[PDB]
């Protein structure tokens, strides 16, 4: 089994890693017949879909497709930084196979950066 | 496959885009028999429904109808700006087909 | 199709609107056999149930009953103001048929917003 | 139908109310075979389970058992005060039948306590 | 029935406890065929999977596997401290069987709560 | 005669409307033999060509092909918002038949 | 020889003047076979074409048809106010025969700009 | 049923909305045989007819055609602002299908209402 | 016979009173085939129709439907305050059954 | 058909991409007999020509493009050029903002 999104992506044909290290700029979701899909965009202009469930998906993927749309919605609403997407590049928009989320800047490191902006203003 | 909500909307008859760039003013949900629906309003007076699941929906839409109501509830509670709604204008209130959210 | 909770409520026998414009005071939930239910209270003493799923519910209501309990829990935890409840008054406690949530700025909350504009101008 | 957790608890044999008026100290969850369960602890040392679904549960309880675990997880993560648990005391750990969460200390009452500290310092 | 994650872990072959007392550093999820899985990492370099559902899982574990992925996602997004993981050490990465989450207010988090009380009093 | 780009587009086989409501991200032009063409891109990754003049064009189109390339160049340089493109989806990149610009 | 667009328009059958004193709202141009045309719209809903070159045009018009499309494009892109169009009303959309551009500050608009300079000087 | 003139107009082929926000400049009416019609003009040069009844009208439209001519006459005589016209653009002049009247206070009409409040305060 | 619009409204199924105490904001009328109708709006966003004459109308209503459209037009043009509308709420927009105007 | 200037350039033997991401520093044009040409330079020191002559129209278009790019200070992203000419001769140009 792979230990990271890059190794996972390399197990499939017609995939590539996009490194975004950015939050999602827009979240679109449709319930229209044969377009039951999600689309996300990033500030850099990159567009990605979760595909409509279809004949190219095996039964095991059905729950994971629904989970991916839940993940993208809550990621968008919490402004979570997306590290990488593994996508199928034979679809337009490119179709999400996997997502990694990583921050960098530690939990109380955002309250230490804010008491360094309030501390270099008073004394 | 369409790349944005406007192109998606243009694939259906009786639809139009509303551009709101505003958070939801009110969220209403009903479990009453034959009215298992949601209604959202905006400060500008615009009213929209997620339709009762029915004979005009194909099986693939059932999960997406439930997802749309989850999306509208969490959008309301987080005050997320709605950019655009694609709606059917042959229903009263106009019925949501798609939503875009942008900060 | 009705356009608001008041018109929706008027389509049923044995219903009434309560206007609360208040957050939920208490949330109670049970997994005990034949009492798989939720109960909410308001400061004013109003008590409401989501009924145990049963013989008086049609199949289309099963998901909506589960959704209503999700809505009440997240409303309670976020202190969301409930605007109106449509309830069946032939049940004890009164049984929820529908809920509306709106940001209806409270009575003394307009005099607290005006002593925050007069207080952030003097000192 | 009972109107509160105390009346609900009194409808079952081998139950008791614990009053905690405290947030959950720990949340534990297992996917291990025959131990698909949750355990919560409180600072006072109290330990409670949501039981593994089993032959002592009726079909109606299946969804409510899953809902209880969702409720305990979101309560833990939001630090919501648990008021009371109704539990079966013939199980070890004691098994959750119902939960109440209660609010009280008012919304704009924290902004009125803070404009009484800022108002008795300037003028 | 066990009362904590350590006793639960000792009931299975090929398991061990890792004590992290740290939030999740990265969350990865895949909908790709035969890799419908999650991977979490910690700052200390530890990598863990939620396994692809398969022939080694009994029916009761299906829901608990889906719950574990929901728990890891919301834990990542809220920066919840993970206390312990019970894992199968015959898988690579080690496969999660159970998770415990406990508050314990962090080391320098008591000196950050005290430089927020001394910083909101002077300037 | 059609009154808008969408009605114009519907008079041809193998065409579709893309709604961009965005300025052009890149303008490419080539004088290389058998590739005397222009390519525009948008931020969203959409790529469109003005085709090399060829056997599939009638004489009346020659001037309009040259005009389209002038329009795309001045639109790019002024950052004018493109509303819609009517394109042939039979070609890769999709080939521009018409453009609308709206404020 | 006519002295202005209104005199020019009166020399043709089936023509009329539209006074817009407004910039072009939209510019549409097509290279599609048999639709080598331009369409402009104004905010007020008026739609106008430059006709496809055809059997109703004399050779002298060919260059002027190409010039009109250049004029409409540069007028659109510079937001130049169109004063008047002379159009054929026997075509749908109405077909442009001539255009006048003047940046015309309206009749009583010069006496309203002068009673705003005399009114923001007294009180 | 449509809720405004724009939605009504979109239900017909060969129609468009003109937004005038202006009173009628001229009203023309004829009782001459086969020309029993009305023509209105606006300052901007727009010309519109109510068609002679016969040819292409169903019986239910006869009263509505007579009503439209009454509406245009009283609108002209009262200088009522016409907001929008829905017209058939396959007729010359364009033929009225519907009219909206709204009192949308013109651009420099808000600066003329404000130099009437500043002029009835000084002298 | 009822003595006011509220009592009149209560004699019909699917009706309700709207109290506007405001002049009409917009008046729309159509002569288009199968849409021979009027629409009025108020500043508060309320939208009402006079329905297309149809199979749901009895012969006695034909003249009253034409009268209602005359009333709404002259009310709009004189800025007369509308007190109440009795409307059918099973139509979209809600369909006018009666109107009261009070000078006060 | 190629979808970008780099793929277009790779279809020809004597060509290479220069990445400038800079506006044109100088624009020179000549109407002199047998030297009806344009020369552009970049701050970098790079010099490029549009060679002296349906490619007829494209040669004229390229000179129009270089002139309006110079006058608007538009950033040139890439040039595809023939490296068997001195100065190197422009085959294609990409502009990105």
From TrEMBL, chains B, F:
Domain of life of the source: Bacteria
InterPro entries, per database record: Enterotoxin (IPR008992), Enterotoxin_B (IPR001835)
Pfam families for the chain: Enterotoxin_b
Transmembrane segments annotated in the record for this chain: none
Stored SUPFAM superfamilies: Bacterial enterotoxins
GO CC field: extracellular region
Protein name (record): Toxin B subunit
Annotated organism of origin: Vibrio cholerae
TrEMBL record, chain I:
Entry-linked Pfam families: Enterotoxin_b (PF01376)
Gene Ontology CC entries for this record: extracellular region
Superkingdom of the source species: Bacteria
Protein name per Swiss-Prot or TrEMBL: Toxin B subunit
Organism taxonomic ancestry: Bacteria, Pseudomonadati, Pseudomonadota, Gammaproteobacteria, Vibrionales
TrEMBL record, chain J:
Domain of life: Bacteria
Ranges that cross the membrane: none
GO cellular component, one term: extracellular region
Protein name, as recorded: Toxin B subunit
Organism: Vibrio cholerae
Gene: CTB
């Amino acid at each position: 089994t792979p230990q990271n999104i890059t190794d996972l992506c390399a197990e499939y044909h017609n995939t590539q890693i996009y490194t975004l290290n950015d939050k999602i700029f827009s979240y679109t979701e449709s319930l229209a017949g044969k377009r039951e899909m999600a689309i996300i965009t990033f500030k850099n202009g990159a567009i990605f879909q979760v595909e409509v469930p279809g004949s190219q998906h095996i039964d095991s993927q059905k729950k994971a497709i629904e989970r991916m749309k839940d993940t993208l919605r809550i990621a968008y609403l919490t402004e979570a930084k997306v590290e990488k997407l593994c996508v199928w590049n034979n679809k337009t928009p490119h179709a999400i196979a996997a997502i990694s989320m990583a921050n960098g800047v530690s939990a109380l490191e955002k309250e230490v950066s804010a008491l360094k902006e309030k501390v270099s203003a008073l004394e």
